[PDB]
Amino acid sequence: MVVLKCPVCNGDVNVPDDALPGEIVEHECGAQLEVYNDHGRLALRLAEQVGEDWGE
Amino acid sequence: MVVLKCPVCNGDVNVPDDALPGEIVEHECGAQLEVYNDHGRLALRLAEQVGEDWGE
Amino acid sequence: MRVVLIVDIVRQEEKLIAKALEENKVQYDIINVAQEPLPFNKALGRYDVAIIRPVSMYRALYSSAVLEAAGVHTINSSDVINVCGDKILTYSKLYREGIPIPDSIIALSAEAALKAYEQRGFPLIDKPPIGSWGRLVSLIRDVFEGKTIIEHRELMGNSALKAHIVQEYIQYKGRDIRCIAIGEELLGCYARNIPPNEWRANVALGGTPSNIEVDEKLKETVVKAVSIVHGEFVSIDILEHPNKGYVVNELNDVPEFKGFMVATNINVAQKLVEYIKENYSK
Amino acid sequence: MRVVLIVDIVRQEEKLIAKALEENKVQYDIINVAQEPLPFNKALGRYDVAIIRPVSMYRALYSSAVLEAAGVHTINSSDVINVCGDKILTYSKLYREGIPIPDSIIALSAEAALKAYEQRGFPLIDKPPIGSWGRLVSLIRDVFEGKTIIEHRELMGNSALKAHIVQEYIQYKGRDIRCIAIGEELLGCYARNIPPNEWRANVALGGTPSNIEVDEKLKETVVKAVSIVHGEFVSIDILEHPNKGYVVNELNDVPEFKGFMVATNINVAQKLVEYIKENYS
Amino acid sequence: MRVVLIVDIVRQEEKLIAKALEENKVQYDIINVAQEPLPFNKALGRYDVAIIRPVSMYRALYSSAVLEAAGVHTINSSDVINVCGDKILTYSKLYREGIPIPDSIIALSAEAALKAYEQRGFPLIDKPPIGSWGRLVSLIRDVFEGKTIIEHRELMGNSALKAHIVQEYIQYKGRDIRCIAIGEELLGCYARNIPPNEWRANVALGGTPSNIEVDEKLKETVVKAVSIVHGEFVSIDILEHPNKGYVVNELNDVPEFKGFMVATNINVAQKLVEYIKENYS
Amino acid sequence: MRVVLIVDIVRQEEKLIAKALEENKVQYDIINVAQEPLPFNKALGRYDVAIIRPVSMYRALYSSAVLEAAGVHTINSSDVINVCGDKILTYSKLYREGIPIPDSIIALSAEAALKAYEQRGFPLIDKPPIGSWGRLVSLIRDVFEGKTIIEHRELMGNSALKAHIVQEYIQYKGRDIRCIAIGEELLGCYARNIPPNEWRANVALGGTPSNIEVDEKLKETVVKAVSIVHGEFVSIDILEHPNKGYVVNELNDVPEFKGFMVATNINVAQKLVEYIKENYS
Ligand SMILES: Nc1ncnc2c1ncn2[C@@H]1O[C@H](COP(=O)(O)OP(=O)(O)O)[C@@H](O)[C@H]1O
Ligand SMILES: Nc1ncnc2c1ncn2[C@@H]1O[C@H](COP(=O)(O)OP(=O)(O)O)[C@@H](O)[C@H]1O
Ligand SMILES: Nc1ncnc2c1ncn2[C@@H]1O[C@H](COP(=O)(O)OP(=O)(O)O)[C@@H](O)[C@H]1O
Ligand SMILES: Nc1ncnc2c1ncn2[C@@H]1O[C@H](COP(=O)(O)OP(=O)(O)O)[C@@H](O)[C@H]1O
Ligand SMILES: N[C@@H](CCC(=O)O)C(=O)O
Ligand SMILES: N[C@@H](CCC(=O)O)C(=O)O
Ligand SMILES: N[C@@H](CCC(=O)O)C(=O)O
Ligand SMILES: N[C@@H](CCC(=O)O)C(=O)O
Ligand SMILES: [Mg+2]
Numbered sequence A, B: 001m002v003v004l005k006c007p008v009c010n011g012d013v014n015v016p017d018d019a020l021p022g023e024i025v026e027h028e029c030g031a032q033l034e035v036y037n038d039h040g041r042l043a044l045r046l047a048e049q050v051g052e053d054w055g056e
Numbered sequence C: 001m002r003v004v005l006i007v008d009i010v011r012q013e014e015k016l017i018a019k020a021l022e023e024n025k026v027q028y029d030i031i032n033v034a035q036e037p038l039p040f041n042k043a044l045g046r047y048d049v050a051i052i053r054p055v056s057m058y059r060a061l062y063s064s065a066v067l068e069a070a071g072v073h074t075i076n077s078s079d080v081i082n083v084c085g086d087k088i089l090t091y092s093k094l095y096r097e098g099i100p101i102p103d104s105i106i107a108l109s110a111e112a113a114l115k116a117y118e119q120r121g122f123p124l125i126d127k128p129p130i131g132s133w134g135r136l137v138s139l140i141r142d143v144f145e146g147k148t149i150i151e152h153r154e155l156m157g158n159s160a161l162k163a164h165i166v167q168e169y170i171q172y173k174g175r176d177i178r179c180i181a182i183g184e185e186l187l188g189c190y191a192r193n194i195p196p197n198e199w200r201a202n203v204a205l206g207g208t209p210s211n212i213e214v215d216e217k218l219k220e221t222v223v224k225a226v227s228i229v230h231g232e233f234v235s236i237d238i239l240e241h242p243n244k245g246y247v248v249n250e251l252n253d254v255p256e257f258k259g260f261m262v263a264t265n266i267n268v269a270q271k272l273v274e275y276i277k278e279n280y281s282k
Numbered sequence D, E, F: 001m002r003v004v005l006i007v008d009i010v011r012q013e014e015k016l017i018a019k020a021l022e023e024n025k026v027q028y029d030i031i032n033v034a035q036e037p038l039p040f041n042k043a044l045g046r047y048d049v050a051i052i053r054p055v056s057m058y059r060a061l062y063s064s065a066v067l068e069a070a071g072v073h074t075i076n077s078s079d080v081i082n083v084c085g086d087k088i089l090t091y092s093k094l095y096r097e098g099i100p101i102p103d104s105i106i107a108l109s110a111e112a113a114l115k116a117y118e119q120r121g122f123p124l125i126d127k128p129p130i131g132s133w134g135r136l137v138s139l140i141r142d143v144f145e146g147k148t149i150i151e152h153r154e155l156m157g158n159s160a161l162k163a164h165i166v167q168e169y170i171q172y173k174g175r176d177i178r179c180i181a182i183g184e185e186l187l188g189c190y191a192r193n194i195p196p197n198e199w200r201a202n203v204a205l206g207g208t209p210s211n212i213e214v215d216e217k218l219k220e221t222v223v224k225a226v227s228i229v230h231g232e233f234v235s236i237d238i239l240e241h242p243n244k245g246y247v248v249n250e251l252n253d254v255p256e257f258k259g260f261m262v263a264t265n266i267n268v269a270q271k272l273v274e275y276i277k278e279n280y281s
């Protein structure tokens, strides 16, 4: 898979080939992360917190 | 007019004969108060603070 | 006919409507929905018409919905309250039908807001879809101001306040125009003049009322806008663009009218009660 | 036909919808509205249909409204999102048409909420009109519990969370019923079984899916409910009352369906894309 | 001697303090910190003593801090306001010195709060470290109630409200004990009796006053707690525990005292002004 | 000697401290306070020293308070976290001691904030007492911007955010100076350079590191400030002022130090572990 850096702990994050931009991945540091596209790169940033209007 | 007690500072509030229950009155202590009906009595409670959905 | 006047905070406007009900011999009750719960059943069907007057837009929306479920005709309706109380929903309906609105871009995150500023350039207005009295309507004139406003919106507790309406700044006359319509017919218009140290025209913020000549294009604009959204008793805010003329900025579902009255001398509460008697007598 | 899939967080449901669009050879783009702003102009009119999938109800609502302004047909529509997204508005529509709902009283202040508890008696359910996944759905069994819940709601930052739906508590089977409709036709139903230490059936809270038999009374209740609110792709939550039978509890405008698939073996994303192709090509 | 009285909303307490200042021939000014800003400079140094009385905790803390920067002695001091304003900080100081407190577990996340409920068992008290008038002090009877409370507090706008103080529920005398100290000397105590339909004693919530006799153990507990926090004009809340005896529940750094006055007929404002005249002239 | 390392989200800084503890043969445990509750009891007294590293200020504050209750020496202490975490409390201690700070006016209401803007004139900086990474630090250029900022902060859910620190805008070197002190001795300093399209120097906002030579005046200002707050492991932010020279802008009680390490090639974690070993064994 692809190896991306955690924007929180700088650890290594193994992101599956399954992953699409916008998917959530959990890292061992305790951070929830979102994958996004930066030009030709997949990258990770801090995921949003659950909003009071979130769900179905 | 009627003399009602401020629920904040215990001082005297002069409420007009105009007064309907639900009307707002300011007092010298800095409190915003709302007129309400308690059986045969007009009384004063602390007014609500402005909400993010308040207005037209 | 039995009317219910639904209130939370009683302002001059509510007092004037109650007085006009009394003066025109209309049987009515007041229910304060900040005090009394409302049941989903047939009990409230004792009222023919409900005049929806809470200051809280959510209280207006929900009291109207509960009364409608009992078969009470509400003014305004919950569908009108939902749409007029939300600037994005209002702009959607207006835009679709060819009513001119300010050139606008919607940004649903801090990231998207910054992109919107970058796409449009400065100056711009950024305001949320909910709010009244000018609250959080922000003039953004450079990237520093833009960045700090974005940060501030991110900390709001109502996630709808995190949606950004980013639009062209339209002001060259020092006022905006406020009209009122009853039964989808124009009642009147006046100018709210912007006070020193303000960028906003709201009477709540110090805007001073004065009269205007109402020309045909203005009347036609207001009438079409109100007909699109189907409001029975609504206000409309209009901006004047140096090239494009009249641009509809918003509509409001629980209109205030103290300023309207000083400028136009129209007895708004009397016109409303007359309209209700005309159309809903039983 | 050109389709746009509107997303913020991409969950398994969004991935399956994108896969179904691909496999059925539908041209589609994905716009992430947590990343891209949306203009009020005619540019978006290049799309014939938008599938509205943000997790944020306000994002779903507003993205739908912008796309509609450009003449794009949205699934669901902004009118449906607004109604199904709000339980008071949904109840109002359903009650007016004689669809059974839980016996409900609406309280729009702390004072009004305590009066509603007193009118109704205990036990009761108190939930706000906005929310999903069981969030703030509270079981109120005595006045101490009611008083503390009232205080907690008063400190919420979204004033819609301060509106109280105070309802009879309907549960004697240990589950609720979840159905999905596409095109105002029933796709299927299944049961969400309440897990230990819960009062709520949501799959998000540990609710376990199982299959059920769908009798004519259930089908007709659902179909009527969906018809009243005009949802194109919606879920419906049904409670079972020991005397009254099926009672409609809520409808949802951006339905999740992982649990629905494990129970029914229905390829929901495939069924959705087939519907869109058949109706909007 | 020149005194400054710092206020935002002038309650009966602040009016009674202003009156006592006037009647004891003390020169004084009032600054309303909801109206006037306070610079960090040497201007405020004209005051010998500040009596800090805003209703808002933040306003009391920050007005105290600005006045202290100018060399004004404040009653209470900013560090006392910080510690007494926060139950965790107060409990920490008290526990370290061996002053009895309710048995408490601190939980700093939703996950940790559920674990703490599991450790303690039901019923229990869960309150946040900030608040007055009983606000968000919850009697949790079972896991359903616990889960809904955790959920509500996660959605609040002040992170201190996400800290859970999980305590044994003390149920013994149907009251709590409210004391006042000035200059670390006990002024006196009275009882606040829990009214029907309550679990809380606060007068604000319908608590009704009555008198108690202060024994040596109560006096020592109160005075020792006050000296640990260095509080100069504070209230102390005490709970009677069937095994531990008197346990300290909290201290308050801007005490209300109309209840105290009704209960004891002690002129708190007069005693406060006399104390200041005695020690700061 | 036994150490406990208190964490919630494990950033590079926490990983480097853990690594340093093991490489230096220090007996240590990690407690994650986002996962585990902490009781007020004597059980935590098994630790000699606690290194307080949660990312949340309230988790840092309260985890420190509970450990201190058990008699554990915490780095930093709850008293230091309370003062360093709050800009107003920090400025108050520094100003009283004659340590230069930016010229500041505190406004504790919307009305007072507008008055303070009128006293200061534009441009000015308005920031709340609480926050990191430059959050809500606003450069106010005119009354229109000021009025909108006041309105926004009035709608926030933490009352501390309603307190405005209205300060002179310092614009001189296009950077700020960031120092670290351990045991109240200066470890070192570097410069954070403000990037294009910013008014703020934070590395988190794109601030770029460079080196400076620390002169005696800088060292004295930093050591004096750290000594006044009694901080044992803290960072210090200094602004260069064209008339005042070095002014202290803030202190941080859970300092990040990745930028410091890159800029100085000083092994901060190692020095910290050496310090603890040297003083608490
Ligand atoms: N795009 C705009 N251009 C110029 N002025 C605007 C714009 N949007 C809002 N305003 C000003 O701000 C005031 C309030 O904005 P409005 O959109 O009417 O929201 P509200 O519902 O808060 O009144 C308006 O009366 C007008 O003076
Ligand atoms: N009136 C009620 N009686 C019994 N259970 C209810 C009631 N309302 C909600 N619930 C339970 O709580 C769960 C979530 O409530 P629901 O109204 O569906 O809101 P949401 O949109 O959060 O899912 C339901 O699946 C059901 O188990
Ligand atoms: N652990 C407890 N056991 C029993 N009663 C409690 C406990 N904690 C609080 N209370 C009750 O709740 C009331 C308010 O709680 P308190 O902790 O004093 O908070 P506040 O600062 O809001 O007054 C107390 O007077 C007491 O009656
Ligand atoms: N009075 C001021 N004058 C000039 N720049 C300032 C001032 N206050 C803050 N800043 C800038 O903003 C940045 C962040 O502000 P700071 O007060 O350190 O808050 P934070 O705690 O969020 O880092 C500082 O690094 C500095 O570059
Ligand atoms: N809400 C409107 C009221 C105008 C009026 O009173 O006519 C405003 O503040 O401008
Ligand atoms: N939001 C629904 C999803 C059910 C499903 O996946 O079918 C729940 O949590 O119950
Ligand atoms: N805040 C205290 C005041 C008690 C008193 O006035 O003495 C209470 O509500 O109980
Ligand atoms: N929070 C600091 C970190 C500096 C550092 O890592 O040294 C900043 O953003 O500038
Ligand atoms: Mg307007």
Ligand SMILES: [Mg+2]
Residues within 6 Å of the ligand: D133, D134, D237, D250
């Ligand atoms: Mg549901």
Ligand SMILES: [Mg+2]
Residues within 6 Å of the ligand: E133, E134, E237, E250
């Ligand atoms: Mg108390």
Ligand SMILES: [Mg+2]
Residues within 6 Å of the ligand: F133, F134, F202, F237, F250
């Ligand atoms: Mg800083």
Ligand SMILES: [Zn+2]
Residues within 6 Å of the ligand: A006, A007, A008, A009, A010, A011, A027, A028, A029, A030, A031
């Ligand atoms: Zn990580």
Ligand SMILES: [Zn+2]
Residues within 6 Å of the ligand: B006, B007, B008, B009, B010, B011, B027, B028, B029, B030, B031
């Ligand atoms: Zn008063």
Ligand SMILES: [Zn+2]
Residues within 6 Å of the ligand: B056, C131, C132, C133, C250, C251, C252
């Ligand atoms: Zn408006």
Ligand SMILES: [Zn+2]
Residues within 6 Å of the ligand: A056, D131, D132, D133, D250, D251, D252
């Ligand atoms: Zn739902």
